[PDB]
Structure formats: structure tokens, C-alpha cells
Amino acid sequence: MKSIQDCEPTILEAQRGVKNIKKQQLTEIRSMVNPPSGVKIVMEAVCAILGYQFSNWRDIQQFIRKDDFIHNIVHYDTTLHMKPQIRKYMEEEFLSDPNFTYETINRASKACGPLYQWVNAQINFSKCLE
Amino acid sequence: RECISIHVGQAGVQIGNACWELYCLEHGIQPDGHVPRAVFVDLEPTVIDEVRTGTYRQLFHPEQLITGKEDAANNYARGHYTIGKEIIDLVLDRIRKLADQCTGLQGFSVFHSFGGGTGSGFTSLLMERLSVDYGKKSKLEFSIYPAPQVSTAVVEPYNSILTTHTTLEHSDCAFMVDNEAIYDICRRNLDIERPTYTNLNRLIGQIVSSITASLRFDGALNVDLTEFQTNLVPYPRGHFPLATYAPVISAEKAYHEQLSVAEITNACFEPANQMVKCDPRHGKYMACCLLYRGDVVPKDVNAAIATIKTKRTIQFVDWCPTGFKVGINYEPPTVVPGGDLAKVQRAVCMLSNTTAIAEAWARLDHKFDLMYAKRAFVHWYVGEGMEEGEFSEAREDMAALEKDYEEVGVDS
Amino acid sequence: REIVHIQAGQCGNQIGAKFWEVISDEHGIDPTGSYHGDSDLQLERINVYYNEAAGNKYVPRAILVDLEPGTMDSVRSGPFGQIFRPDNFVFGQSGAGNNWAKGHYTEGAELVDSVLDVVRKESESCDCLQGFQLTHSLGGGTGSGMGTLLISKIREEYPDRIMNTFSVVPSPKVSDTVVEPYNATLSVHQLVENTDETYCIDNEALYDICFRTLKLTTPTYGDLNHLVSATMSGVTTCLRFPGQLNADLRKLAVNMVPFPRLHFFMPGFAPLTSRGSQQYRALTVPELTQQMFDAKNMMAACDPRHGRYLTVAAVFRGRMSMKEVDEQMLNVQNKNSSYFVEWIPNNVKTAVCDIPPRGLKMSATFIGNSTAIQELFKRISEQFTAMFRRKAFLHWYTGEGMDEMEFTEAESNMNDLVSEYQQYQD
Structure with missing residues (x-):
């Protein structure tokens, strides 16, 4: 057969994950001086996924404010799963917290959930050779 | 104290x-x-x-x-x-x-x-x-x-x-x-x-x-x-x-003989002299406190209230049959120089709980809707550690206080 | 709570010079820096705008930025020139070499530091920082290139305050400058990401108002400049006097923007009387609105009338029956109910400070946030695309080490923003 199997329809799911997002949701987010903690943990999760070194809110504003924030997202690898250790890191760090919890975030702003869904995909595909 | x-x-x-x-x-x-x-x-x-x-x-x-x-x-x-x-x-x-x-x-x-x-x-x-x-x-x-x-x-x-x-x-x-x-x-x-x-x-x-x-x-x-x-x-x-105060008038609509006890009380129910755009005409009252102060003698009141008690435009609500109180104090209101009320001799603050405020609650719930309905101005709040919750739950909440202040009308 | 100027560029210096002419005079301050006013109230808030120096001379906290240096020998030449404290003036020697790229890599890219330096040394000499006003033009050298760089450093060191930008947009049919669309378009992309409150003023709309609304024969760049400063004292400074209802800088902003694409405003001042011709005794408040909402008392390109306003903010300032204001505003929201946006539910944000501007007896700045501002960026974007289309000047840019691709970028980007403003033309 022509399948990869291991996480297979996760990578057709992860594909919805990139096609969801809308720029205006980012533009408001990047303006947010101090959004709730529910935003904050999600953004630490994106920063790890893109593999910036770990952060905290002050630093995160300075980072996210960049021109290429949205661009890097739109330029990214949906097919990345090539040996990040960001999987075992992100799991020790976040997939063990039930406040990293889809819903809380899912209401959080407009479409913050789709971003959580995107991260979740980048983790749940990263289960790729499990 | x-x-x-x-x-x-x-x-x-x-x-x-x-x-x-x-x-x-x-x-x-x-x-x-x-x-x-x-x-x-x-x-x-x-x-x-x-x-x-x-x-x-x-x-x-x-x-x-x-x-x-x-x-x-x-x-x-x-x-x-x-x-x-x-x-x-x-x-x-x-x-x-x-x-x-x-x-x-x-x-x-x-x-x-x-x-x-x-x-x-x-x-x-x-x-x-x-x-x-x-x-x-x-x-x-x-x-x-x-x-x-x-x-x-x-x-x-x-x-x-x-x-x-x-x-x-x-x-x-x-x-x-x-x-x-x-x-x-x-x-x-x-x-x-x-x-x-x-x-x-x-x-x-x-x-x-x-x-x-x-x-x-x-x-x-x-x-x-x-x-x-x-x-x-x-x-x-x-x-x-809602609060109402009674004899509001200026220092030369003062001379038009006494403000009778009887009058000032009547002048409260007048839906053009309350304080909150609402108008009690179709409100049911449910409870009043008329506090008088100055030379008002219990009897006077206790007569003037009777008249109201029968005026019948104004509705008390069924499941109460009473509903009054009376404050009489002495001390005839005192008059701040840089203000504009006359040297009255007695005034009457009736405050009272009415299903009319169903009104007031409406407009704002309405206004709000429009704006939330787009999301509009949200970002100034979201970004301050306050949530999407608080929007939804503070409407849905307040709607469900608003059916109570209607339901507690009229149903006996 | 106190706040900090930045005057980049030619205009950006020039306007400055009047603004501190105004502001000073609203607090009884000499040219020297010593106070000689009347009423303590004047002197109560100097801090917003000053620093106290030893002896007793309050020197204005500005920064005076320019990539050439006769500019500065004019600003200090002025009549209210002593004031600044010399250490502030950061010139360069290049010339406003009138290429955005040269002011944003290259010659300004060098100078930056000798400015940030003065900003931190200024920033930390005051208590509570509020924001920076950055004044400048999308015209000259230093303005669109170099100042639009400048903010990108500020908004990364001080990433929470507000940032007012007063930009003197490139006035369509009264231009100089054959490169305009290059010099504008590159900066507007950069403004729309990073400043939170931006005000477009345009020289010919500005003109207009001076020969017909004033009836002045000869409108000097100087006069015009003078008129601009009243809108800027009028926004801010005013709330740094007492009030009735008092909005303010955070608030003003925080009442406008219905989503977050910065949104650019349009100032309108309000008791303009043409000299001898208007000593018809007639000041109230129905005129002040009468005037203000009139499509030829906008300081900025278009006539409101082809679109909506989204928010409006009238900051009145003298004695008044606070009712008759609150009413008036209402009527206005009903007579022209047609175009005011039917899904925001009230628009005006009234504020009312409480002292007059000097001779007058009440004034009142308008800050309109209209969708009519589609009609400026189309205009600009047009001239660009058309002349970009044949690459047609491109080299005084390429050669400073920037690609073509920026020229694409910026256009696309900036053009898309116009799209947004039209969505709420609905």
C-alpha cells in the first residue's frame, strides 16, 4: 500500500489546521498587551513549536510583534515531524497539564481554538513513529 | 449608628x-x-x-x-x-x-x-x-x-x-x-x-x-x-x-400656596417626575417607602396615601395587597446656597421597587447586542486578562434576571 | 503620567517649533523657560511636558531629529528656541537625502542610536511615561524612511505605551517631489503595524481651510503649521487640565478602534473666525458643532460624506452646560443618521476639559475616524502602482540595499488595508 500509517489521517487533519487561520485574528492577538493566561500558555506552545527557545509574556510580546510572525506561520512546514525533541519537551511541559485544555482556550478569543488545534496537530502528528 | x-x-x-x-x-x-x-x-x-x-x-x-x-x-x-x-x-x-x-x-x-x-x-x-x-x-x-x-x-x-x-x-x-x-x-x-x-x-x-x-x-x-x-x-x-424626590420646584414657583402633603405624594407617581427613563405606567409597583420630612403629620399622610391607594391608573401588584411605609422625620430639608431649590417645608422620597425597570434593562441589553454581534470593540478587554466568558456570561446572565423582574409581575 | 515628543524630519521639525510655541503659552512660560503665569492651575501639570530644571526653568522634553543640520540651526534660531536643552538635538550631516531607503538603512540607520540614547535618558527621567508623540511627514528624507524606522525601535523597547503619530500625508494635488509614492507607500506599511494612533493631515486640505474658512490671503507654510498645532494641544494637553467628564489619551484611543488596524483619524478644530469678518457675537455650542462636522473643516483629504464615520470624539473645552453639549451631539447623530454606521450604536465620545485656549472662549477638537480614508490610500496607491509599473525610478532605492520586493510587499499589504476600511463602508 501507499500509506505511511503512523499518524496518517492526522496529517490530513493537521492539513485543516493550517487552512483555518485568518490574519486579522493574529493582528488583534499581537496587539494584546496582556491577554489572559489561557492565551499565554498557548503562545508559549507556538513558540516552542516553531522552536524559539522558551519564553514568558514580556519576551513573547517582543517576539510576536515582528513582521514575520504571521509570515512564518504561513511559510511553515506542515510536513515537519523530522526529529524535533520538542515533542518530548512539549509533552513533559504541556500535554501533562489539563489547563492546556482545548475548551478554555477554545472559547478564549475568536479562533484561538483553531490555533490550539494547529498546536495540538503539531503534537499529535509528532506521535509519528510511535 | x-x-x-x-x-x-x-x-x-x-x-x-x-x-x-x-x-x-x-x-x-x-x-x-x-x-x-x-x-x-x-x-x-x-x-x-x-x-x-x-x-x-x-x-x-x-x-x-x-x-x-x-x-x-x-x-x-x-x-x-x-x-x-x-x-x-x-x-x-x-x-x-x-x-x-x-x-x-x-x-x-x-x-x-x-x-x-x-x-x-x-x-x-x-x-x-x-x-x-x-x-x-x-x-x-x-x-x-x-x-x-x-x-x-x-x-x-x-x-x-x-x-x-x-x-x-x-x-x-x-x-x-x-x-x-x-x-x-x-x-x-x-x-x-x-x-x-x-x-x-x-x-x-x-x-x-x-x-x-x-x-x-x-x-x-x-x-x-x-x-x-x-x-x-x-x-x-x-x-x-428607582428613586424619586418630590417637591423640586424653584424659588419662584414657590409661591403658589403650600405644597400639601396630599400633593407631593401625588406628584411622585407622575411618570414625568421620576428618575430613570422608564415611566411606571405599565409597571406594577411592588413596594414603596415614602419618607417625608418636615411638618408632615401622620394623619395627612395617612389619607393622602389612601387616595393613591385608589387611583387605579397606578397599579399595585396582586400578590401583595399592602404596601407602604412611611417615614416621618423632622428636619425640614436644608438648602445648599449654590443650588436651586426653594426653602421648601417638606419633601418626600418615595423609592420603590417596580417591574417597570424591565425597561432600562432592555435598552442596554439591546445596545450591547449590536456591538457584540460583530465582536467590535473587544480587543481592549480581551487583552487585559478578562475573557470571552465574561462577555457571553454576563449577557446570558442578565437576560435571566430580566425574566424574573417580569415574571414576578402579574402571576399570582 | 507624563509624555515625550519626537520630532523627526523637516516638517517634523517645523511643526514642532510652533507646537512648543503654543503649549508654552498655555502655561505662561517665557522663551527662557521660567514661568510667569497667573493661575496656579497652569503650572500644575507641567510635568506632562516638561522637566523641571534647577533654578527654575522647565525645559521641554523633546528630541529633535534630522539627517542634515541647518534645520537645527533654524530651530534654535527661532523665537522660542532657547528652550530645548542642547543636549537633545541629534543632527546628522547627510542631508534629507530624499530617498526612503537611504533613511532607513544607510544614513539614518546609523544615526538611530544617537537618538535612542536620548530617549532612554529621557524616558527614565520621568516618573510615569505615558507615550510618545512622533511628529513628522511622510514628505522629506528623514520623515517616512527614518522616522518609520525609529518607531520600530521604540515599540520594542517600550512595548506598551501609546504612540501618537502626526503624519503630514502626501497631499495629492499639491505635491512636490517626484518620488512621493515611493516615499509614502513604504512607510504606511510600517505605520499600520505599530503605532496606535495616527493622524493624517494634508497640506491642501489644510490650505483650503486657510483661505476660505479663514480668509487669509497668503498662507505661509508657517501659518498652516500653526493651525496644526492647535489640534495637537487640543487633544492631549487639554485633559492635563481638570475637567467635567474627562476622557484622555488612553481613552480616546480606547474608544475608537473597532478592530485593531490602527486607524487613522482626521482632526478638525473649531472656532475659526476670519479676522475682521467675524465679530458677529455668537458663540455657543450649536455653532461649534455646526462648524466641526462640516466637510470643509476637516484637516484631511476627503470629505466625510462618501462614507461613514465609525467613531467620533469631540473634546470640548471651556465653560458649558454639559447638557447642551450632550444633546447637540445627539441631534447630529440623528440628522445625518444616514451615514453614521448603524451597527455601532452611539458614536460620539464626548469629553470636556475645562480651560479655554487663551484668547478664545471655547474650542473643540474633533477626531473623526471615517471610512472616507479609503479615499486617500487609493489615490496614493494609484500613483505608485502606475509609476512602479515601469520600474520607473527605482534605482535611487535599489542601490541602497533594498530589494524590489519590498515595493511589491508594501503595496499589497497597504492596499489590503484599504479593503478593510471599505468593509465598514457598509
Whole structure:
């Protein structure tokens, strides 16, 4: 057969994950001086996924404010799963917290959930050779 | 016995500032003797700053004018969480040096405003922190609540739908004025065309002296702060009077013979002389407190009320058959020079709990909808550690207080 | 709570020079820096705008930025020139070499530091920082290139305050400058990401108002400049006097923007009387609105009238019956109910400070946030695309080490923003 199997329809799911997002949701987010903690943990999760070194809110504003924030997202690898250790890191760090919890975030702003869904995909595909 | 007072917000301090004057005139305090017994809280200096300077420098011990110095927001969130958080403590401390400066008070007259800098959000966290530290006491807030048209901001609607849930569950009985509805009164019944935020404040400073102040002068058939919480509520929910005062007229519609007791009471039910655009015509009343003061003799009243009791435009609600109270005090209202009411001899503050305020709740719930319906102005709040929750749940909540204030009508 | 100027560029210096002419005079301050006013109230808030120096001379906190240096020998030549404290002036020697790229890599890219330096040394000499006003033009050298760089450093060191930008947009039919669309378009992309409150003023709309609304024969660049400063004292400074209802800088902003694409405003001042011709005794408040909402008392390109306003903010300032204001505003929201946006539910944000501007007896700045501002960026974007289309000047740019691709970028980007403003033309 022509399948990869291991996480297979996760990578057709992860594909919805990139096609969801809308720029205006980012533009408001990047303006947010101090959004709730529910935003904050999600953004630490994106920063790890893109593999910036770990952060905290002050630093995160300075980072996210960049021109290429949205661009890097739109330029990214949906097919990345090539040996990040960001999987075992992100799991020790976040997939063990039930406040990293889809819903809380899912209401959080407009479409913050789709971003959580995107991260979740980048983790749940990263289960790729499990 | 006597009773601390907290004004929070641009507004609330102004309200104080008039109102606290009248008091002091009232007992014959100079601008110095004993020392006022209340506090002014705000996140943006300039208002309080006048107060530190304009006559009445003295007459507060300067501990109690706490002023922030950072922003004022103008948007709840920030004022509740984020900025305001810093100040809380420091305020909370004064009233706890101030509680224990005195024995057996009954509650906190808050005056806080439903638009203004601080002071939906902030108040939100204040009445809440009092409610846990002083779970028992009485919490009367006179809040100022935004007109059906004459709004002056583009987030009046956001602030006020956020506030309800904080005041619903935590303030005992919340009085409402509105700026717009006050305007008529100044124009027609008083006859000025300059009604500044400064004139109306001189007014509310009169309706308040008649609840409390005056009761403390002890007269003939006295009413008291617990009493309310029995007589005006009638269920659990924090229920909301509307206030009305009676003989408002100016110093040369004065001469038109006495204001009879009989008249002034009749003049309250008139839906062009209340204070909150609402009009009681199809409201059912449910509870009144008529507090009279000055030469009003029990009998007079107890006749004039009978007439009303039969006027039949005006409906009491079925499942109560009674419903009155009477305050008679002595002390004939006192008249602030830089104000505009006549030397009356007696006036009558009926406040009362009506299903009419179904009205007022509507408009704002409506306004709000439009804006939320796009999402519109959200980002100033989201970004302050306040949530998408708070929007949805403070509407859905307040709708479901609004069916109660209708249902408790009419169904017997 | 106190706040900090930045005057980049030619205009950006020039306007400055009047603004501190104004502001000073609203607090009884000499040219020297010593106070001689009347009423304590004047002197109560100097801090917002000053620093107290030893002796008693309050020197204005500005920064005076320019990539050439006769500019500065004019600003200090002025009549209210002593004031600044010399250490502030950061010139360069290049010339406003009138290429955005040269002012944003290259010659300005060098100078930056000798400015940030003065900003931190200024920033930390005051208590509570509020924001920076950055004044400048999308015209000269230093303005669109170099100043649009400048903010990108500020908004990363001080990433929470507000940032007012007063930009003197490239006035369509009264231009100089054959490169305009290059010099504008590159900066507008950069403004729309990073400043939170931006005000477009345009020289010919500005003109207009001076020969017909004023009836002045000869409108000097100087006069015009003078008129601009009244809108800027009028926004801010005013709330740093007492009030009635008092909005403010955070607030003003925080009442406008219905989503977050910065949104650019349009100032309008309000008791303009043409000299001898208007000593018809007639000041109230119905005129002040009468004037203000009139499509020829906008300081900025288009006529409101082809679109909506989204928010409006009228900051009045003298004695008044606070009712008659609150009313007036209402009527206005009903007579022209047609175009005011039917899904925001009230628009005006009234504020009312409380002292007059000097001679007058009440004034009142308008800050309109209209969708009519589609009609400026189309205009600009047009001239660009058309002339970009044949690469047609491109080299005084390419050669400073920037690609073509930026020229694409910026256009696309910036053009898309116009799209947004039209969505709410609905």
C-alpha cells in the first residue's frame, strides 16, 4: 500500500489546521498587551513549536510583534515531524497539564481554538513513529 | 449608628463632592470640627486633585483620598484585573482602619458609576472584596446608569453588561439614576437650561440626605436600613428601586400656596417626575417607602396615601395587597446656597421597587447586542486578562434576571 | 503620567517649533523657560511636558531629529528656541537625502542610536511615561524612511505605551517631489503595524481651510503649521487640565478602534473666525458643532460624506452646560443618521476639559475616524502602482540595499488595508 500509517489521517487533519487561520485574528492577538493566561500558555506552545527557545509574556510580546510572525506561520512546514525533541519537551511541559485544555482556550478569543488545534496537530502528528 | 461611604470613579467623586458638602452644611459643620467619615477612590488623579485643593482642603484627614496614578482605563477589564489590582490593597486597608474607628455601623453607601474611568470593573472587585470581609453588612450602592440615548461613550454598553453580575450578587440593594432622565426635571421643574454634571450632582445629594442623614435626626416614625431589605425586596434578588424626590420646584414657583402633603405624594407617581427613563405606567409597583420630612403629620399622610391607594391608573401588584411605609422625620430639608431649590417645608422620597425597570434593562441589553454581534470593540478587554466568558456570561446572565423582574409581575 | 515628543524630519521639525510655541503659552512660560503665569492651575501639570530644571526653568522634553543640520540651526534660531536643552538635538550631516531607503538603512540607520540614547535618558527621567508623540511627514528624507524606522525601535523597547503619530500625508494635488509614492507607500506599511494612533493631515486640505474658512490671503507654510498645532494641544494637553467628564489619551484611543488596524483619524478644530469678518457675537455650542462636522473643516483629504464615520470624539473645552453639549451631539447623530454606521450604536465620545485656549472662549477638537480614508490610500496607491509599473525610478532605492520586493510587499499589504476600511463602508 501507499500509506505511511503512523499518524496518517492526522496529517490530513493537521492539513485543516493550517487552512483555518485568518490574519486579522493574529493582528488583534499581537496587539494584546496582556491577554489572559489561557492565551499565554498557548503562545508559549507556538513558540516552542516553531522552536524559539522558551519564553514568558514580556519576551513573547517582543517576539510576536515582528513582521514575520504571521509570515512564518504561513511559510511553515506542515510536513515537519523530522526529529524535533520538542515533542518530548512539549509533552513533559504541556500535554501533562489539563489547563492546556482545548475548551478554555477554545472559547478564549475568536479562533484561538483553531490555533490550539494547529498546536495540538503539531503534537499529535509528532506521535509519528510511535 | 453612622456609616462609611465609598465613592469610586470620576463620577463618583464628583457626586461625593457635592453631596459631602451638603452634609456638612446640614449639621452645621464649618469647613472643620469632626472629620468625614468616608473615602474616595480612583485611578487617575485629576478629579481627586481638585478636592485636595478646593475649599475643603481641611476637612478630610488626608489618608482617605486614595488616588492611583497610573491610567484610568476606560474600559472595565483593565480596571478590574490589570491596573486596579495594584490599588485594591491600599484602599482596603483604610476602611479597616476606618471600620474600627467606630461601633455598629450598618453599611456602605457606595457611589459608583456605570460608565466612568474606574468604575465598573474596579467596583466589581471592590464590592466583591467587601462582601467576603464583611459578609454581614448592608451595601447600598447608588449607581448611575447610562441613558437610553444620551450615552457619551462607545463602551457604555460593554461596561454595564459586565457590571450586573458583579452587582447582582453582592450588593444589597442598588439604586439607579440616569443622567438623561434627570434632565427633564431641571428644565421643566426648576427652570434652568444649564444643567451641568455639577447640577445633577446637587440633586442626588439631596435624595441621599433623605435616606440616611435625616433618619439620624429622629422624628416621629422612623425607618431604617435593615427595614428595606425586608420591605423592598421581596424575594432574594438584589432588587432595585428607582428613586424619586418630590417637591423640586424653584424659588419662584414657590409661591403658589403650600405644597400639601396630599400633593407631593401625588406628584411622585407622575411618570414625568421620576428618575430613570422608564415611566411606571405599565409597571406594577411592588413596594414603596415614602419618607417625608418636615411638618408632615401622620394623619395627612395617612389619607393622602389612601387616595393613591385608589387611583387605579397606578397599579399595585396582586400578590401583595399592602404596601407602604412611611417615614416621618423632622428636619425640614436644608438648602445648599449654590443650588436651586426653594426653602421648601417638606419633601418626600418615595423609592420603590417596580417591574417597570424591565425597561432600562432592555435598552442596554439591546445596545450591547449590536456591538457584540460583530465582536467590535473587544480587543481592549480581551487583552487585559478578562475573557470571552465574561462577555457571553454576563449577557446570558442578565437576560435571566430580566425574566424574573417580569415574571414576578402579574402571576399570582 | 507624563509624555515625550519626537520630532523627526523637516516638517517634523517645523511643526514642532510652533507646537512648543503654543503649549508654552498655555502655561505662561517665557522663551527662557521660567514661568510667569497667573493661575496656579497652569503650572500644575507641567510635568506632562516638561522637566523641571534647577533654578527654575522647565525645559521641554523633546528630541529633535534630522539627517542634515541647518534645520537645527533654524530651530534654535527661532523665537522660542532657547528652550530645548542642547543636549537633545541629534543632527546628522547627510542631508534629507530624499530617498526612503537611504533613511532607513544607510544614513539614518546609523544615526538611530544617537537618538535612542536620548530617549532612554529621557524616558527614565520621568516618573510615569505615558507615550510618545512622533511628529513628522511622510514628505522629506528623514520623515517616512527614518522616522518609520525609529518607531520600530521604540515599540520594542517600550512595548506598551501609546504612540501618537502626526503624519503630514502626501497631499495629492499639491505635491512636490517626484518620488512621493515611493516615499509614502513604504512607510504606511510600517505605520499600520505599530503605532496606535495616527493622524493624517494634508497640506491642501489644510490650505483650503486657510483661505476660505479663514480668509487669509497668503498662507505661509508657517501659518498652516500653526493651525496644526492647535489640534495637537487640543487633544492631549487639554485633559492635563481638570475637567467635567474627562476622557484622555488612553481613552480616546480606547474608544475608537473597532478592530485593531490602527486607524487613522482626521482632526478638525473649531472656532475659526476670519479676522475682521467675524465679530458677529455668537458663540455657543450649536455653532461649534455646526462648524466641526462640516466637510470643509476637516484637516484631511476627503470629505466625510462618501462614507461613514465609525467613531467620533469631540473634546470640548471651556465653560458649558454639559447638557447642551450632550444633546447637540445627539441631534447630529440623528440628522445625518444616514451615514453614521448603524451597527455601532452611539458614536460620539464626548469629553470636556475645562480651560479655554487663551484668547478664545471655547474650542473643540474633533477626531473623526471615517471610512472616507479609503479615499486617500487609493489615490496614493494609484500613483505608485502606475509609476512602479515601469520600474520607473527605482534605482535611487535599489542601490541602497533594498530589494524590489519590498515595493511589491508594501503595496499589497497597504492596499489590503484599504479593503478593510471599505468593509465598514457598509
